[PDB]
């Protein structure tokens, strides 16, 4: 079932953000890398998939990431735009405790690392609902995430036989 | 006129709309239909996030337009 991951039909929405629709189990090709459910398990999970010898506290270096990022490309981010927040009033909230990402940082995050983030989204089984990936990678090259219920985040690394 | 809103769990749904509708209205509209808060509503269409305080008329969406819908995931 890898001639299926090689198959995956992005549809490019604005420049350089895709959408997909596919149907599979999140379970099917990667391995699920729990992440706290502590408000910042957005952080945590990037932290797990681009950090060597992660530990919890590691992802304070993807919010400071996130803040130069920010001070790059906040003002241009469409998804900003719903914000509605000046780059000082963003940055704080961002930076606070607890506080939690979103797709807004997958973005900035993207461009910052020079990396390609897909953020598989499910429905309590798993079941892949859709997916939205920031940057022109593929599956196999980018850090994906899993996006479950409201606000969690895990990590997810692709299988060894994929 | 009809326009098509293909929400990001992959189904179409179907907008009553006229020219004179707000990008404000329309997300109104899908937030009636799927119960989606327009805070987390990105409304795409050739290639452009519309914006709030223009119209469909500002982007020239004529009938039965294909317009996208991706949500802004994570609090």
Same mark, same amino acid.
């Given at each position: 079932s890898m001639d299926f991951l090689r198959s995956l039909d992005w549809t490019?929405?604005?420049?350089g953000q895709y959408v997909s629709n596919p149907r599979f189990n999140i379970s099917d090709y990667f391995e699920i890398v729990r992440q706290p459910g502590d408000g910042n398990c957005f952080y945590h999970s990037i932290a797990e998939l681009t950090?060597?010898?992660?530990?919890?506290?590691?992802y304070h270096y993807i919010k400071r990431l996130t803040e130069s990022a920010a001070r790059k490309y906040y003002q241009e981010?469409?998804?900003?735009?719903?914000?509605?927040?000046?780059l000082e009033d963003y940055l704080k909230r961002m930076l606070s405790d607890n506080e939690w990402g979103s797709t807004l940082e997958a973005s900035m995050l993207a461009k910052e690392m020079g990396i390609t983030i897909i953020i598989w989204t499910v429905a309590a089984?798993?079941?892949?609902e859709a997916g939205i990936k920031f940057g022109d990678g593929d599956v196999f090259t980018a850090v994906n995430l899993l996006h479950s219920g409201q606000t969690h985040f895990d990590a997810l690394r692709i299988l060894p036989q994929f | 006129m009809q326009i098509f809103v293909k929400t990001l769990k992959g189904h179409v749904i179907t907008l009553e709309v006229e020219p004179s509708d707000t990008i404000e209205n329309v997300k109104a509209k899908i937030q009636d239909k799927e =119960?989606?808060?327009?805070?987390?509503q990105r409304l795409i269409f050739a290639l452009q996030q519309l914006e709030? =305080?223009?119209?469909?008329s500002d982007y020239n969406i004529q009938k039965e337009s294909n317009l996208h819908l991706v949500l802004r995931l994570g609090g």
């Open positions: 490019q929405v604005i420049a950090m060597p010898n992660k530990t919890d506290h590691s981010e469409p998804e900003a735009r719903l914000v509605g927040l000046s089984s798993d079941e892949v | =119960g989606i808060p327009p805070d987390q709030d =305080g223009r119209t469909l």
